[PDB]
Ligand binder design. Sequence first.
Ligand code: A1ISY
Ligand code: A1ISY
Ligand code: CA
Ligand code: CA
Ligand code: CA
Ligand code: CA
Lengths: 103, 103, 113, 113
Amino acid sequence: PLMVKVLDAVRGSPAINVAVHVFRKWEPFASGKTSESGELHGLTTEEEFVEGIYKVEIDTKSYWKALGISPFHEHAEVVFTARRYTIAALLSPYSYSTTAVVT
Amino acid sequence: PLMVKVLDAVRGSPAINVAVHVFRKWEPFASGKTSESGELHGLTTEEEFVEGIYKVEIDTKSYWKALGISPFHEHAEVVFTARRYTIAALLSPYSYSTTAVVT
Amino acid sequence: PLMVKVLDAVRGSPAINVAVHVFRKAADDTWEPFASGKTSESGELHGLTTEEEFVEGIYKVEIDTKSYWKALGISPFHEHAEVVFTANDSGPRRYTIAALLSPYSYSTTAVVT
Amino acid sequence: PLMVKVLDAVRGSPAINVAVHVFRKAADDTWEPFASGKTSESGELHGLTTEEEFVEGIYKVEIDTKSYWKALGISPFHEHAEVVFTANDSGPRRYTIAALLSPYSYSTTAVVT
Ligand SMILES: Cc1[nH]nc(N)c1-c1ccccc1
Ligand SMILES: Cc1[nH]nc(N)c1-c1ccccc1
Ligand SMILES: [Ca+2]
Ligand SMILES: [Ca+2]
Ligand SMILES: [Ca+2]
Ligand SMILES: [Ca+2]
């Protein structure tokens, strides 16, 4: 029911091995690291993911430090009210954009 | 070797049935319409897609008119020098962002 | 030293009368309220803070995009847009945080001078 | 009536000395050169045109992002960033085209007042 996809706008690549944490209003409850394709599947389950207010926190700063690229943000976080949901993020050192795809 | 993916930032959805045209420096040579997932596969072939300068033109204005949403841009176009390439676009009525994923 | 600018990608306009809340991380690792304000008719919020107040630290700027969209009559996806960043670590700088809003997306960038 | 603002998402800065070319679609459906300039130290390009010159029509603003990135020593993906839009169709308006640049991406929005 919830997937994250992270892309790198500097290198033109998926953002790989990025830490992602999910919280519900903040109680952490799901987290993982992006795969080779920049995607993080299997965070949660249909049973667990109830309506409510969620935060997806992506650890952009350690991703940029692993690349030797100087970052601005501590993270990127995405807070929304809750179908399948994809939270997509496109990362640059001093900016990020995020959209939700709800199908 | 070349795929396009289009997302809608107003509705939170893939952008479906959007016309996409590809040109090589401008000679048109590949075009199609996005699927239900907002993706357009099979534009070209490994043999056809040589190094050079390309333009991907996405017909955003007819997509926004089909939705009853007033657009700004005539289109979105993406011009680059040429692996597999994904051109991703995220659409709003008065803005668009585009990135390339090169794997 | 800190300004915030907010634009609407649906209407092609400045995002007016948007609430912006700033917090600073405190020593016990909670967020301390630091400054707030609302965007003007140009979508800009100036006068949040002063050179004297704005010390080094980790800040959170939270833009209330939910109430902006509901005041337009639209049901948005996100509760707010934000940036969390470390400020002034090599001395004072001037930071502009710009945010571009749509119902299901936003982007934000920082300009540091 | 037309301004362009360009920001760098890598450096967190204005994109200075960026070339911007404006074209207008002519009656035979070719692009006619309309105006050009370079961004200032604030990343802004003012004085492109005048109310009198800027009539209704379909414009293309082409931002030379390739030479910006190569002058920084970086090999970018896109040749340029752009917008193509119909201007002044219900009378004069003021248009700001803003663009945010990274080596493999860009976004652009329009603010119309
Ligand atoms: C192109 C763009 N800008 N901002 C974004 N989140 C995206 C995007 C990210 C992943 C997939 C498709 C689009
Ligand atoms: C925050 C953002 N995302 N995409 C953009 N073009 C912007 C923007 C760029 C220049 C000036 C102001 C905002
Ligand atoms: Ca769990
Ligand atoms: Ca063909
Ligand atoms: Ca310090
Ligand atoms: Ca007219």
